[PDB]
Structure formats: structure tokens, C-alpha cells
Design a protein around this nucleic acid. Structure first.
Ligand SMILES: [Mg+2]
Ligand SMILES: [Mg+2]
Ligand SMILES: [Mg+2]
Ligand SMILES: [Mg+2]
Ligand SMILES: [Mg+2]
Ligand SMILES: [Mg+2]
Ligand SMILES: [Mg+2]
Ligand SMILES: [Mg+2]
Ligand SMILES: [Mg+2]
Ligand SMILES: [Mg+2]
Ligand SMILES: [Mg+2]
Ligand SMILES: [Mg+2]
Ligand SMILES: [Mg+2]
Ligand SMILES: [Mg+2]
Ligand SMILES: [Mg+2]
Ligand SMILES: [Mg+2]
Ligand SMILES: [Mg+2]
Ligand SMILES: [Mg+2]
Ligand SMILES: [Mg+2]
Ligand SMILES: [Mg+2]
Ligand SMILES: [Mg+2]
Ligand SMILES: [Mg+2]
Ligand SMILES: [Mg+2]
Ligand SMILES: [Mg+2]
Ligand SMILES: [Mg+2]
Ligand SMILES: [Mg+2]
Ligand SMILES: [Mg+2]
Ligand SMILES: [Mg+2]
Ligand SMILES: [Mg+2]
Ligand SMILES: [Mg+2]
Ligand SMILES: [Mg+2]
Ligand SMILES: [Mg+2]
Ligand SMILES: [Mg+2]
Ligand SMILES: [Mg+2]
Ligand SMILES: [Mg+2]
Ligand SMILES: [Mg+2]
Ligand SMILES: [Mg+2]
Ligand SMILES: [Mg+2]
Ligand SMILES: [Mg+2]
Ligand SMILES: [Mg+2]
Ligand SMILES: [Mg+2]
Ligand SMILES: [Mg+2]
Ligand SMILES: [Mg+2]
Ligand SMILES: [Mg+2]
Ligand SMILES: [Mg+2]
Ligand SMILES: [Mg+2]
Ligand SMILES: [Zn+2]
Lengths: 135, 77, 91, 63, 112, 252
RNA sequence: UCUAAGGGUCGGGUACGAUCAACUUAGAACUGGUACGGACAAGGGGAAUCUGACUGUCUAAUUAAAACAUAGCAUUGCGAUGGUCAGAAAGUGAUGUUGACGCAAU
RNA sequence: GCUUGUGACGGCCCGUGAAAAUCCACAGGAAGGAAUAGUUUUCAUGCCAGGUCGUACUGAUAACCGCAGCAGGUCUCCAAG
RNA sequence: GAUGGGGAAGCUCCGUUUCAAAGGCCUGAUUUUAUGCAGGCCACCAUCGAAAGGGAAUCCGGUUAAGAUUCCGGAACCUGGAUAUGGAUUCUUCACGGUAACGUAACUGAAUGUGGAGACGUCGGCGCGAGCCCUGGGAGGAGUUAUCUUUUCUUCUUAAC
């Protein structure tokens, strides 16, 4: 079955965000006026949460857990569809075609995705997605 | 070393502290195909670089020259 | 327009060294210069330089091999011997 | 004056010739020249549509 | 017709002694010595010259800003970005099939 | 009389090796915990010509078990070994071309290169392009393994002595005629100054045991005693026979 | 003094025209005290015998050779606690960053 | 066209044709860091300093070596019609 | 070619990381104070050896009886040291953009690790740059001119950065 759908996690295989994990928010499966290729809008993690230990305490833990997100229009050919899947409910409204075009709109979009990601990470949900893929 | 165009930036150079001296140069040059015209270059000597700004237009030329700081040592020609 | 009746590549040595040395050398020259099939990617791009070293024009794999030819007769009959003895350690 | 009478075709006889015809002009240079003319004529005829790529490809090798 | 002389004491044609002939405002021919051409940096995996990086002589790379020495993606000024894609995919697949091996031999320890 | 040529070679002036361009000493991995209890993996990162050597070298890269770093070793490339291959060195390593295993761990008939004399001597026997040793048996108590060397010899070494599976690359090099003085010239130019060779029969007496005479001739038997003395030994030394060898040689 | 052959650049709806710059080669006339690679420049050729295969090397300052070398052929020694060689001796050294498709000796 | 530089290729090898100082980059994430205001001198501009010894000329049928202002010997770059 | 060593009656010979307890960097701990201890490193084991190898950075014009990439004039650049101002960055702390190759004036990065440059044969033809050579017009000067030649010669240049 078509595996590029609203749940699919994937790894960015090319571009600045290469090697970072994303979640397709909504597929453009064929075409566009621009983007003349099958592509996807993804929310993804730029600067991952660093490891935490018992030695970490107080508001140092708050620092290690801060997550810098990103959002991208991406050719399918630059994604490596994973087996894992993460739930896109919170930022579905946030990541739109019109979200790109007007940077001010992108910055607010990340703002939500940032809070959405930091929520999910605490309480240990979708764990793999919050760890760096080492290469 | 360096050439300049934005005429606002040039003015800010003339006031840039370490700039003690400037110089103005006048040359006869030709317009397009036909007759000549009076080209004038505004050279500011900075510490590590010498900026020169061409004003190809004789009108903008003189009205620029008065705008120079009265505290500047200007070498004419 | 066949240029030489026999000498082939060996016609560079001219009349020198005597026929039976040129015979011998020509055989091993034709061996060493020729392009070979690449086991890994399957285009015949494998060429020598530095005896025993055979590398591929693209895909850039390098294989150690005979001095004038990619696979040497003994290497093969060793390749099968190692097949055999390994299967003894399996089954 | 001598160079002019050259371009008028003079002083080129068999008795004015010292280097072998190869040293005078290389046979290879003639070929490389000629072969590049035919090579690039095919290209324009092909990119005009005056000649179709299949006829072009045979001519390229017959060239 | 105008000939030229070396501009330094080394008389010889070595690699660091290259010459270049140049017409000066004086209207004369003068020589000038020519630094050796720099070579492009190379990728650590494949070995091609990696694009986007300025090609200088080694100590000159300290006189230039870091964006002449890198491209943005991770392993920027280092590997050739097809090579990075390779070791992205390979990383993911091998970490995945590693998990495929843990759970299969976990079954072998349960059933045997 | 003079000091003859083969005596001068010993003090190493013009006779030392021409070593500048060589890639390095070719050695097996130091014999450590990993190799003797386990195995350890590495990648051949290159296979490269060595100046003055007929067989290629394989630069092989291993992790360092006790520190974060890469330690590079130089093997002698076995034929069929290729770049990017994984090489397995250890007692428990599988048997495939390129891996390094103790002789005790391979069945007889295994063909193995760069094999150690004592265990851990980082390799001795059958390193020249085309050679190899065969395992002709093991004696597990007082653990040994018996091998046939390229010379034809048979020798018994420790079962822990390590070989590397297969034959050395570059074989057949000696089959091609040099054809001319220069090809030999350029050969020894990267080895040592042994070339060309004056016949001691074309020298004067002061120069050689074979020197002098009103015709070139050796003048006395060219077979010299083992017990001869420096400056005497030029000839066929300790020769137990001589003349054209007729009949197959092939040790029994 | 003529003739011919051999090229470049453009616009053409989805057969050509137009201009610019090159010695090369061959053929034809006329012409002269038959001269003309006009100075310069520039291989004598052939048939054999002896001998070394060849290219290469040497007696600086009477010998360049048929002598030395060479590839090729054959022989010898040696698996490292070794072969050959160095040193008065050595916790010394050359071959050896080497291992018989190797080093060493003829 | 000539000299030179340089590129992309091709021939060659039982020859496959130095080293180190030095410079940069990447992987890493130790740590240090903002809202009453912190981080940044690999962006720009700006301030100071840069020691010691050689530096003339010949380089050759007269400046070197041949007893000498010796027809000998003695490494190299530029190169018009 | 010194050194712990090992030979040698001995002048000295051997060895060069060799059978050796072989050394020093980044900062913290000081607010008796000037620098002891605190970690964590790194275990590289002298040094000499290139005025043709490697290598941080300068050019043109002018000037002297004789010096010049060194002086004078103008214009640069490199290394080291200090440092402030502007810009950048951050309330989503450690930039954005491009599907991507990548971009840009910036755009924190210790230990440790790794990659590149340094850094490399020779010949052949092909491609291109530079300087030279050839040459048309014009603007100047000079030569020849019994006769012939809109002629013969020459000037028309542009450094590093
Ligand atoms: Mg031809
Ligand atoms: Mg053409
Ligand atoms: Mg074709
Ligand atoms: Mg000089
Ligand atoms: Mg050269
Ligand atoms: Mg860049
Ligand atoms: Mg750039
Ligand atoms: Mg004696
Ligand atoms: Mg040596
Ligand atoms: Mg010799
Ligand atoms: Mg001989
Ligand atoms: Mg001999
Ligand atoms: Mg004699
Ligand atoms: Mg004698
Ligand atoms: Mg005797
Ligand atoms: Mg005799
Ligand atoms: Mg004889
Ligand atoms: Mg025509
Ligand atoms: Mg025409
Ligand atoms: Mg001869
Ligand atoms: Mg000869
Ligand atoms: Mg003589
Ligand atoms: Mg004499
Ligand atoms: Mg002769
Ligand atoms: Mg003579
Ligand atoms: Mg014979
Ligand atoms: Mg090469
Ligand atoms: Mg670099
Ligand atoms: Mg700066
Ligand atoms: Mg001088
Ligand atoms: Mg002088
Ligand atoms: Mg004297
Ligand atoms: Mg003289
Ligand atoms: Mg000593
Ligand atoms: Mg020194
Ligand atoms: Mg030097
Ligand atoms: Mg130098
Ligand atoms: Mg001057
Ligand atoms: Mg002078
Ligand atoms: Mg000055
Ligand atoms: Mg500075
Ligand atoms: Mg480092
Ligand atoms: Mg390095
Ligand atoms: Mg070099
Ligand atoms: Mg001129
Ligand atoms: Mg410069
Ligand atoms: Zn391949």
C-alpha cells in the first residue's frame, strides 16, 4: 500500500536537514505548479534533545530537552520511509501549503511544532524519533 | 583599492573618524558615442583602503562637493 | 587493413631480442593490457597498472590478482579448494 | 612584397620546397580540420530537423 | 624582442620558481614570480574534489571565512553529499536489521 | 690481492637497500586478546603497489579495542582480496580468502600465505608474489601443524602460528621475459645495487679467485667447501651435485 | 601569368542566400645562353669472409675492440636457532620496510 | 605561428614515480550562554608592532679553477625579422 | 649524531627509541599571594642535515657617479598583539534560504577522533590563457623623394591588490 501518508516517519536523505527524522504532515503525491514532483510537507527535528542522566538535575534538564524543529517541502526521492509512525494531529492545521510563503507564518508553525515535539518527548512517547541517527 | 556607488554610504565614510584626507579628480571623458562630458571621482583615503566614488553627472558633482565635511582636508585635483 | 601478419603489439620491439622472446612477451602483454569484466558491477572496465592490481574505471573497486592477468589459474583452484574445505566445517 | 606573391601562389614550386610535405603541413592537421567540419555539419542539420537523428548517427560513424 | 630576467636570486626553473611576463604602466616587459597553483580539496570517502569549497593553498584557508570552507549539510566541507546520503541510508538500514537480528535470535533462545 | 666483490657487500655502503619509496613493513596484526580468543573485523581500505616488491600490499583498517581510534595495518594482498572487503582475524574466524587464522584452526589442504614461524612473529613464510604454504597435518597433543613451504620443504610449527587464507597476488610475474638490459636496470634500481654483474673470470687475479689467465677459465674446481673462508667462497658453495638437472625434482 | 579543389559567421513557418579571414595541394600557359635543393644546407652505393646478437660500457693523457655488460640459458647455497658478507669487541652490522615468483654465489 | 603556462584525456612499467613542518575542515558535544537583556570577533571598520645576518660588482677568450689578463675547464633563466 | 646503556687497556667503537622511573599543555584551585595543588589529558624521546626540495605576505612609477621587489612616492597584503564601534544572532536561545546539487557578510563548539591540502613519473596529440610575432584604420614624429611609392621606420602603455 502507499506508505507515504499522514503518519509515516522518514529520514531526510539530502539537503541541509540530511539525516534528520521527520513526519510527513500531508503528501502532495503528484505534481504542483511549482514543485513539479511528488513531494511532502514534513515537520522534523533540527537540534535533538541531548542525553540526560541522574547527574542532570534542576533546570539543566530543561536545557538538554529543548528541541529545535524544522518544516520542509521535500521531494519524495530525498526521504527514506521508515517503519515507525508518529501522530500528526496537533500540527495538521499548522503545516499547510500556505504556511510556506511568508516566513512569519513558518516561524509560528515551528512554534507549535516545537511545543508539540517537546510535549511528546517528555512522557517518553515515540522515543526513537527523538534520538539522532548516527552516521 | 575599493570603488563605491551608494551616495549615502559615501557620505558616511567622509565622517568615519580615521578619514583625515580626501581628494577630488576631474577628467574629460566622452559620452556614449558622441561629445565629451566632465567625469569626477571622489576619493576618500581610509586607514586600510582607499574608496573612490565616480559621479558621472556634472550636476550631482558640485552639489555633492559642498556636502563634504568642513573639517575634512580635501585635495582638489 | 590488417597492419602486421603476426607481431601484433610486439612490433614495437622491431627486429630485436629474437622471435621466441617476442612471442612470449606478446602473450603476456595482450593479457595485461586488455579490459576485464568487473565482478561487482558487471561492466568490462577492469584494467591493470602495477602488476597484481586490477581496478575498475567506474564503481572504483580494486582487486588484487595475477601480475599479467586478473585471475590466475592457481588462485581459482585455490578458490574452489577453500569452498570445499569450508563446507566441511559447515555440514 | 614576397609575402604578397606567396598569397598569390608563387615561389611554391617543387624547387622551393625543403621540408617534406608532412613537415610543411601535417596530414593529421588536415584530417582533424576536415573531420571537425563534417562532425559539426551533421550537428546543425540534425538540430535543424533537416536530418533525422537516425540518419545522423549512421553519418557520424561513416564520417 | 624585449627579454626578461628573474626577479630573485634563484636562477633555476624549479617548481617554486615559475615566471610570468607582464606589461607594466611604464610600457616595458617585467617578470613576476608565480605561486604554485592551489589544488581543490578532496572527499574522504570517494575522493572527488568536493564542490562549494574554495580552493586555496593550505595556510590561505586561515585568511578566509568558514563559508568558503564548508557547505551546509552535515559532513559539509568533508564528504561529497552523495557519499553522505550513502552513509545515511546504510546507517538506518543496518541499525534496523540489527533490531531484526535481536528479536529473531531472542525467539531462537525461547524456541529450541 | 684485493677484497673481492661479495666481501664488500657486507659493510653496506652502496649495497644497502633502496628503501625510500616503500609503503612500509608488511606485518600481520600484533597477536592480542581479540585475535587469539575471538576474531576481529577490518576493512581493506586500499591495495597498493610497493616499490621493489612484486606483490601488492593491502592497507587494512581495524578499530582499536582499547582506545577510540583507527589502527592501520599493512598486509600482503592475497589474490582475490579487494577494496572494501571485510577481513576477519582470529582463532574463531571463518575460513575465507583474506582472513587471518591460526594454522591449528584450518583443515589440511588449506592454502595460506604470510604464515608465522613462531606464533606472533607477524608473519614470515611465503610472502613473495605467487607463493603460499599448504597444511599437510596437525598433531593436536603438543599442538603443531605441518606445512609444505614454497621451497618444497616440510616444517612443523605451532598450531597458534597464524596464516592468511589463500595465495599472494601478483603471481606469474617471473614468466614474462625482461627482454632488455634496461628493464632489469629499472628493476634493481628499486631494490639494491646488485646489477650488472662482472664475471669473476673477466677480472684480474687481485680481484677474484677466478681472475687472470691468458684465457678466461676458472682454473680450479668452482665447487667450494662449506668450511671455506671469506674471500674463498665464490663459486658453487657446498654443492652436493652439479651439471644440468635431468629428471623431475619434486620432493618425495 | 592563370585555373580548380579544400573553410567560418549569422537569420529561415511547426532550395539557397549573405559576408569575413586563411597557405596548402594539384593542373595549365608564357619565359631564359637548358638555368633553377642556383649561396647556405645536404646519405656514396653494391657482393662477400671473419667476429660480437642488438642499444649500452672501459684503459682521463698512445689500445673503443672481437674486450666488459646485457636480456636469454644453466648451475649452487639457504625456512631465520638461516644462507652470503661486515667487526678488535659488542645488548654490533649489511642483504632486510626482506622470506624461495626471495636473498646470496658462479 | 613562436615561447611558455594550464586543462580534460591517452601511451608506458617485474620502474606505478619523497618526507616533514604547517594550514584547514568534519564527527563529536564538554561546557558557556537571553528579555529588562545576554552571546557572538572565522562579517565590516578601527589601534600598535614586525628583530638578526646577506644585499656592491664579475660569473668569464681579463674579476672562478688551470703558476698568468692561458684558444682548456666550470650549473641555469629571457630570446625579434 | 648527543643521551640510560653495551663494547674497548685506551684514543674511542656500537646503538637512536635502543632492555631507561626519559616529559608539558590546557585550565582550575588563590582572593594569607603569588602561583602550590585539583582533574583530564598527550606519551611525541634529542639534535644537525636543502641560499635548486617544502614554505605566511608587495606591486607599479620615480630616483643614484655607484643601491634597489630594500630608498622616495602611491597603492596593498601577511603574521602577532590588543581591542572598541557598526552589523549578525536570541523571547523557538547557538541564522536563514533552496525539492536538490548548494547558497550567504556573520552565523558559540573543549577533550578525543577523522578527512583534506602540503604532496609529487614520463611522453603524445587535442583545448584554452599569457607574452611575443604578423597586420587594417586613425592620431603624432622621423627617413626617402632626378624619378616611383595614400610610402619606409617609430609612438599609441596599464602592476600588485
Ligand atoms: Mg597519421
Ligand atoms: Mg567546424
Ligand atoms: Mg557511433
Ligand atoms: Mg637579482
Ligand atoms: Mg619537470
Ligand atoms: Mg561554501
Ligand atoms: Mg565559494
Ligand atoms: Mg686484501
Ligand atoms: Mg636501508
Ligand atoms: Mg653497479
Ligand atoms: Mg656478467
Ligand atoms: Mg653473470
Ligand atoms: Mg682482463
Ligand atoms: Mg687470488
Ligand atoms: Mg682458490
Ligand atoms: Mg683464471
Ligand atoms: Mg671460459
Ligand atoms: Mg575558394
Ligand atoms: Mg563563401
Ligand atoms: Mg657490439
Ligand atoms: Mg653499440
Ligand atoms: Mg686511452
Ligand atoms: Mg696508466
Ligand atoms: Mg665505439
Ligand atoms: Mg683512442
Ligand atoms: Mg643461445
Ligand atoms: Mg599514477
Ligand atoms: Mg581544506
Ligand atoms: Mg576578523
Ligand atoms: Mg645586484
Ligand atoms: Mg650582476
Ligand atoms: Mg695560486
Ligand atoms: Mg681562458
Ligand atoms: Mg654515536
Ligand atoms: Mg634544520
Ligand atoms: Mg630553503
Ligand atoms: Mg625553495
Ligand atoms: Mg624601478
Ligand atoms: Mg645596478
Ligand atoms: Mg614605500
Ligand atoms: Mg589580526
Ligand atoms: Mg586534532
Ligand atoms: Mg592529518
Ligand atoms: Mg617534492
Ligand atoms: Mg612594436
Ligand atoms: Mg602578489
Ligand atoms: Zn565495477
Amino acid at each position: 500500500a502507499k506508505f507515504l501518508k499522514a503518519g509515516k516517519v522518514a529520514v531526510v536523505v539530502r539537503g541541509r536537514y540530511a539525516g534528520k527524522k521527520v513526519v510527513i504532515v500531508k503528501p502532495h503525491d503528484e505534481g504542483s505548479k511549482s514543485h513539479p514532483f511528488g513531494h511532502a510537507l514534513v515537520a522534523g527535528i533540527e537540534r535533538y534533545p541531548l542525553k540526560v542522566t541522574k547527574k542532570h538535575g534542576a533546570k539543566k534538564v530543561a536545557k538538554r530537552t529543548k528541541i529545535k524543529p524544522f518544516i520542509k517541502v521535500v521531494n519524495y526521492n530525498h526521504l527514506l520511509p521508515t517503519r515507525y509512525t508518529l501522530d500528526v494531529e496537533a500540527f495538521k492545521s499548522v503545516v499547510s501549503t500556505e504556511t510556506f510563503e511568508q516566513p512569519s507564518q513558518r516561524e509560528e508553525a515551528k512554534k507549535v511544532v516545537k511545543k508539540a515535539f517537546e510535549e511528546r518527548h517528555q512522557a517518553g512517547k515515540n522515543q526513537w524519533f527523538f534520538s539522532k541517527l548516527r552516521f | 583599492a575599493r570603488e563605491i556607488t551608494d551616495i549615502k554610504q559615501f557620505l558616511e565614510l567622509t565622517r568615519r573618524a580615521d578619514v583625515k584626507t580626501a581628494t577630488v579628480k576631474i577628467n574629460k571623458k566622452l559620452n556614449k558615442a558622441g561629445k565629451p562630458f566632465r567625469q569626477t571621482k571622489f576619493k576618500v583615503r581610509g586607514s586600510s583602503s582607499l574608496y573612490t566614488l565616480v559621479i558621472n553627472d556634472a550636476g550631482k558633482a558640485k552639489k555633492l562637493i559642498q556636502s563634504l565635511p568642513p573639517t575634512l582636508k580635501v585635495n582638489r585635483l | 587493413a590488417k597492419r602486421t601478419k603476426k607481431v601484433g603489439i610486439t612490433g614495437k620491439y622491431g627486429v630485436r631480442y629474437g622471435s621466441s622472446l617476442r612471442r612470449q612477451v606478446k602473450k603476456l602483454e595482450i593479457q595485461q593490457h586488455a579490459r576485464y569484466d568487473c565482478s561487482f558491477c558487471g561492466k568490462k572496465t577492469v584494467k591493470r597498472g602495477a602488476a597484481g592490481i586490477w581496478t575498475c574505471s567506474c564503481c572504483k573497486k580494486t582487486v588484487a590478482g595475477g601480475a599479467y592477468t586478473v585471475s590466475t589459474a592457481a588462485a581459482a583452484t585455490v578458490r574452489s579448494t577453500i569452498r570445499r574445505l569450508r563446507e566441511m566445517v559447515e555440514a | 612584397a614576397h609575402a604578397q606573391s606567396k598569397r598569390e601562389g608563387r615561389h611554391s614550386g617543387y624547387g622551393k620546397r625543403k621540408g617534406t610535405r608532412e613537415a610543411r603541413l601535417p596530414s593529421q592537421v588536415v584530417w582533424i580540420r576536415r573531420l571537425r567540419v563534417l562532425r559539426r555539419l551533421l550537428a546543425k542539420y540534425r538540430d535543424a530537423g533537416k536530418i533525422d537523428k537516425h540518419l545522423y548517427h549512421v553519418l557520424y560513424k561513416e564520417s | 624582442a624585449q627579454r626578461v630576467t628573474f626577479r630573485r636570486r634563484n636562477p633555476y626553473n624549479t617548481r617554486s620558481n615559475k615566471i610570468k611576463v607582464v606589461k607594466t604602466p611604464g610600457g616595458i616587459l617585467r617578470a613576476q614570480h608565480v605561486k604554485k597553483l592551489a589544488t581543490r580539496p578532496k572527499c574522504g570517502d570517494c575522493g572527488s574534489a568536493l564542490q562549494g569549497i574554495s580552493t586555496l593553498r593550505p595556510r590561505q584557508y586561515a585568511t578566509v571565512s568558514k563559508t568558503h570552507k564548508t557547505v551546509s549539510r552535515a559532513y559539509g566541507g568533508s564528504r561529497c553529499a552523495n557519499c553522505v546520503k550513502e552513509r545515511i541510508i546504510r546507517a538506518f538500514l543496518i541499525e534496523e536489521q540489527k533490531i531484526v537480528k535481536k528479536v529473531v535470535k531472542e525467539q531462537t533462545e525461547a524456541a529450541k | 690481492g684485493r677484497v673481492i666483490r661479495n666481501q664488500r657487500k657486507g659493510a653496506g655502503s652502496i649495497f644497502t637497500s633502496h628503501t625510500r619509496l616503500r609503503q612500509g613493513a608488511a606485518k600481520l596484526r600484533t597477536l592480542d586478546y581479540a585475535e587469539r580468543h575471538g576474531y576481529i573485523r577490518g576493512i581493506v581500505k586500499q591495495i597498493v603497489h610497493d616499490s621493489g616488491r612484486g606483490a601488492p600490499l593491502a592497507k587494512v583498517v581495524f578499530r582499536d579495542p582499547y582506545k577510540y581510534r583507527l589502527r592501520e595495518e599493512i598486509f600482503i594482498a592475497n589474490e582475490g582480496v579487494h577494496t572494501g572487503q571485510f577481513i576477519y582475524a582470529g582463532k574463531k574466524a571463518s575460513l575465507n580468502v583474506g582472513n587471518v587464522l591460526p594454522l591449528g584452526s584450518v583443515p589440511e589442504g588449506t592454502i595460506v600465505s604470510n604464515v608465522e614461524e613462531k606464533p606472533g612473529d607477524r608473519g614470515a613464510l611465503a610472502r613473495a608474489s605467487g607463493n603460499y604454504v599448504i597444511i599437510i597435518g596437525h598433531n593436536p597433543d603438543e599442538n603443531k601443524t605441518r606445512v609444505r613451504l614454497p621451497s618444497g620443504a616440510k616444517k612443523v610449527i605451532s598450531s597458534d602460528a597464524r596464516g592468511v587464507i589463500g595465495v599472494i597476488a601478483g603471481g606469474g610475474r617471473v614468466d614474462k621475459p625482461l627482454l632488455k638490459a634496461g628493464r632489469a636496470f629499472h628493476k634493481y634500481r628499486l631494490k639494491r645495487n646488485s646489477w650488472p654483474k662482472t664475471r669473476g673470470v673477466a677480472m684480474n687475479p687481485v680481484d677474484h679467485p677466478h681472475g687472470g689467465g691468458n684465457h678466461q677459465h676458472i682454473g680450479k674446481a668452482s665447487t667450494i667447501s662449506r668450511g671455506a673462508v671469506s674471500g674463498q667462497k665464490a663459486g658453487l658453495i657446498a654443492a652436493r651435485r652439479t651439471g644440468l638437472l635431468r629428471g623431475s625434482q619434486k620432493t618425495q
